Symmetry: D3
Subunit: 265 residues, 6 copies
């Protein structure tokens, strides 16, 4: 249990809970939050027993810094090319994280917050969740990998309308579009994230990491490359203890350690 400037981090039942802790400020994606998230990721890397992550906030907020923009308006192309790279190093790290990441969204996920939610493996939301890409309001292009991530979630035409309109997607529509897996009342959201995360603790870390890594590049790739990635990944999976444990159980007419997510209740 560690309380940081921009988040609280707690490991309970092999689940790393990242609770962003500046709800009134809407947890802005600034250098301070980036640094705290990097600290979390480094702790996660060094500890295989942190099996699953939940990314969330105090209720009513998620993630949604103009002074730092103002101060750097004329800093020049070389500066901005590098500053974008700093942001992208973080997104790169999220996509490469070999643990499942569940985002629980109970407030605005705008700009950086929407990009952040797009790096999660599973997104759960309440009816309070709002998603928006509003960079064009600032005369800017979408950053933090949004140009890459959004079309892979919703297709080209939908990405275009979202980024040009800068409109807010509500939870129901985000669910309709497959950005959000399930919608729950605000008062029930954390428990659902808990149930799902704790179920994934029982899943094989190797199978999890390899499945995530392959899915994350699938739409960048081609048939033979993905077929070769499948072959290497399955070979790796079969050299772990989990398939035997699962197979023996099922042949003994018993349920395997990972049975999927718990039924909604």
């Amino acid at each position: 249990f560690q309380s940081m400037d921009t988040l609280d981090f707690e490991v309970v039942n092999n689940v790393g809970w990242i609770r962003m802790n500046r709800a009134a400020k809407h947890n802005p994606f600034d250098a301070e939050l980036r640094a705290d998230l990097m600290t979390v990721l480094e702790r996660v890397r060094d500890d295989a027993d942190i099996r699953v992550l939940v990314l969330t906030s105090h209720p009513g907020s998620f993630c949604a810094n103009l002074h730092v923009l103002r101060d750097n308006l004329d800093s020049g192309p070389a500066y901005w090319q590098q500053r974008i790279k700093t942001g992208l190093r973080f997104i790169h790290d999220m996509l490469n994280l070999g643990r499942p990441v569940i985002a629980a969204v109970d407030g605005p996920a705008f700009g950086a917050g929407f990009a952040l939610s797009l790096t999660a493996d599973i997104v759960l939301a309440s009816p309070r969740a709002r998603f928006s890409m509003a960079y064009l309001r600032l005369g800017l292009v979408p950053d933090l990998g949004a140009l890459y991530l959004l079309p892979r979630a919703v297709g080209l035409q939908r990405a275009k309308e979202l980024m040009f309109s800068t409109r807010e997607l509500d939870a129901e529509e985000a669910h309709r579009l497959g950005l959000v897996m399930e919608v729950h009342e605000s008062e029930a959201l954390e428990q659902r994230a808990r149930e799902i995360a704790e179920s994934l603790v029982q899943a094989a870390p190797t199978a999890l990491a390899l499945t995530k890594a392959a899915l994350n590049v699938s739409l960048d790739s081609d048939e033979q490359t993905m077929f070769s990635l499948e072959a290497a990944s399955q070979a790796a999976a079969f050299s772990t203890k989990e398939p035997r444990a699962a197979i023996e159980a099922l042949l003994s007419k018993q349920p395997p350690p990972f049975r999927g997510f718990p039924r909604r209740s």
Copy 2:
């Protein structure tokens, strides 16, 4: 009309009907089914008069072998890398088949069965159809090209939730997501597959094969490559008899040989 160990194959009105014939066992995707399907594909290749294929089962099943997994748990990486390749040779062959393939799903399409349904050009289902990727329950990564095929059907976020949750998609949701083209009552399903397949018999084999081949790689490719594929494909299509027959008919105020699928009734 040939009755095999795992399927019955019948050609009627230029349509090859593949009826998997082990409903009680849920038509497991094993070496025996693979070999029988390969036999069918080889017969299809040698006979241009088998214009369309329907892949189906005795009602109540579709396609859904743990002993062979158990026996090979510690066979090693080299073995598994090769065994995955054997499976992938088959999927490669399905995707490369120059005839339209209609899958008619009236039962569970799980794991290999879901991958199999993903290789079809058109999927028809009843309310009994269930789709699931449950490899993670075994501590394994999805195989038979699922990592490649699923995101191309539903996008990255949806593929992720399906593969991590291992949940069952019902027919209605599969239709909503575009996996399934139409949902029909079990008692009406075969006749619809018949109507659709027999309509495609009238379509140009060259246009059909080239359209399928281009679509199958579209999302792996890029603008100039696909533009070049379009140019080569259309040049090839114009060197067949079908455009003349279709054009002459339409200019004579008559319907062309292929008018689309029959209206639902």
Copy 3:
């Protein structure tokens, strides 16, 4: 204000209105329309003050030439490979146009017309709009980049069913599938296109063009390439006047010049 053989072009409030003007003939995509559209694009390129384009028709039509096909049925592969390239030069130009293009569809968008609508950034439609790829009825493969564009809008399985069935998508389903952003009554359609287009006049031309160019290739590309494109694009955006104007306004508790699209009314 210029009246051409196949369209009328009018610039009003920095919006270029392209009104195809052969409604009775359904504005066929022929050499004449291509040439007139090319003239428009060349005028747009030379005039940065034409900030947004609306592509539309006299009401009841959109875009939906068999004699030229008949006359060239046996012209040969070299001929057809080149003629396809001529068509594709135009589509290439549409996708590369650095201004937002709004299509307002109040009638059939068939074949070439559907391809044309797919090159727009935003599609608005009435309940009269119908979309269809019916090339297979002619024994031909889809042209004008449809094999490339359609799967990027709707995924592989949906593209396949649309192109094999040759069915007509109504406005409601096209909206459901994300081809169409909003559906409006025919009598209200033009005003909505007007409202949206005039709002985009306030958006930064640089941010607009760079966002469009990046989105248009996102699904052809990969993580590191798109990350590098993001970095270069943002560096370019920050060297324009619009971010300062937007940021100063927002820090002064005032709305920025571009606030998104006007609320539906």
Copy 4:
């Protein structure tokens, strides 16, 4: 035979000779040359009897406009993004030209001239030929598709050293690196280009165009996509008269119409 402001164009024995005609100015790649080259390309498109092109200059020059750069130094990102696109439209057209293009280089091919030579199918050079990418001397990135074309010719490491060093490659090294097919004395260069071009007149236009189009995208693509392009292209080639003529000749123990390039003499 047409004499233009920046080139002379002559068709002799089905070969289109493009002779750039401002040797003292080193045939700068300006709006005037672009427009004249576009005129040539349009004439080539409309006339299938112009089977092969030779791109060359009065001896001692090839292709190697700072005032237009100076005048536009502060024109801004939107302007430059569009002006680059104008240049790239031309390069796109060169790469898409379905006729073989032979470049005969007897002088500096610098910047735009090097890019131009990279779009040719065959490059012949004299010992006077020099190749250089010197954009970095101007504080600029390489343009006219050089970032795309050069690594496909020489690999990444070599492209990097060339573009960072801005060094001049002589004919011998360019030949060593495969940029240049053959090196001939200045006094012999045109006749070799003539011999090679006239030999290609005998080659099948369809096979030529399809081979060029496939090669031009090969390194952008993947196994299954290129295999599908091969299949469509060969199907198209077999629907022409040339294979029969070639096969009949060879079975009659006679040489085919196209036997390759004439022996060096």
Copy 5:
């Protein structure tokens, strides 16, 4: 030891020797050779103890069927699209073979023979070896994956000159271009192939197969995809016995089982 119609197959010291046995006919790549090679590949798949393959011929020939072309000149696009696919199934199988393939070339490798040599992992040649792509002499595009394979070996410009010129590459130039690893006198060629093949018997089958599979797709892919393939492949390699055996040996100041190829002598 099995003597077939088009080749003799012999396994000696864990090396599968494929000796094509129709030298006078230049071992034409016909249905008969394809079928015999497929038989070999199937035997190789079923026997992990066949660790390395050598593909060769009786001396003076390698691999270089016009009647079957003549008979099918007007068979049509659908036919040819399928026949090309049959050929490509074979090439696909060669590239996917998880054993190292050494080609020993002591004669013409023309057309199909050049494509065949391009699928090998290592090519050894004598001064008698000649390589040529001469499809354009027949009015055809290069087949058997040449459009894909050649640019990956030599770059775009070189592939173009080779395919347009249809010239013969001698051993020395092929070695210069990296097609050929080593050139040996005809009388010494087989022994060198023997030495190299028997050395690879000591290499880890898993590392071999995974390295080959990754290299074969590297130029089709991108940074993050290849990084993910590396991670999965190394994880798989570390679950084999060979690293321990190699590491223990080297730490004991002893040579590992695989030390590279024997010195030339």
Copy 6:
């Protein structure tokens, strides 16, 4: 001037000199060297005045840890998948570094050292330089991005022979293959690296960084994507001071600040 455990770092005339300082141990690529190199990269990022980097060693060595391998032989797939990712984070950072990196190689560059040299923009070597990929000797696949980097430098066939043979490339051959830009006597090597690095100090940081970023992804990409990257990059370059300074100088008949590398002497 900072002396670290595995390297000394010195900034002289805007050039960051990285001098690896464990020559007797051959500067092994271990956690300690990685951490020190990361420290350097972080200092480079924070200081735009460190314009160019030289990566080198005390003479006689470059970069060429079995105990850490031995200790982790059976740590499992999940562990190794993550440890490979740690290594790849570093390589990713090298490729993304917006400053030119010159490697000066005066000794063995083996395994990790060869991968490291492949991330440099320019490689200079002495006749003492040796390059080798010898992972297969350990029963392992090449790591640190070698599977990605090597084919982009030398093509597929050459990468294969290098990785399967595990042979040592001498300086002369590495230069022949374009891995090495220039070969200099050991006693002259550092001064050449100095001359080249100090010349690049005069080059535009924006043009440098954008050119590097585009080249690094060129072979992963496609025509339209690279054309769009070119457009965005040039727009960014024109918003810097360097083009004006260079253009004004050249129009004044004076040399620009960056004239290329100094002549060899």
